[PDB]
Amino acid sequence: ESLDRCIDDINRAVDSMSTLYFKPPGIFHNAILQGASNKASIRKDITR
Amino acid sequence: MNANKQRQYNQLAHELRELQTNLQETTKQLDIMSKQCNENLVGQLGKVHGSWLIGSYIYYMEQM
Numbered sequence: 001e002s003l004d005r006c007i008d009d010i011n012r013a014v015d016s017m018s019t020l021y022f023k024p025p026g027i028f029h030n031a032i033l034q035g036a037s038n039k040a041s042i043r044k045d046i047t048r
Numbered sequence: 049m050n051a052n053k054q055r056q057y058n059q060l061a062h063e064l065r066e067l068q069t070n071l072q073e074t075t076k077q078l079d080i081m082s083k084q085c086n087e088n089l090v091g092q093l094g095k096v097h098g099s100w101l102i103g104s105y106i107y108y109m110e111q112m
Contacts, residue, residue, distance in 0.1 A: 035111075036111070042111060046112070
């Protein structure tokens with residue numbers, strides 16, 4: 001019973017791991033990073 | 049001495065003393081205004097903001 005409820009706890013925990021969502025980066029993040037990534041990258045971004 | 053000119057000169061003296069007091073006040077206000085302009089407008093706000101702007105300009109010009 002207690003072992004079974006701990007099994008249920010582990011299942012709930014791994015489920016909660018699955019549902020976790022880390023926010024993807026936005027707009028100016030990508031803009032400034034690509035405009036500071038590489039010389040070809042900075043030129044392409046300053047063009048874009 | 050003409051009494052009319054006497055009263056005219058007395059009025060002139062009173063008005064000039066009033067002028068002197070007003071000019072003293074003007075001098076104080078202009079000193080305060082100069083302090084606010086030179087030390088703050090350009091001395092602190094202008095210098096710091098210009099420094100930031102030129103630094104950013106140099107950074108992003110070298111990153112052309």
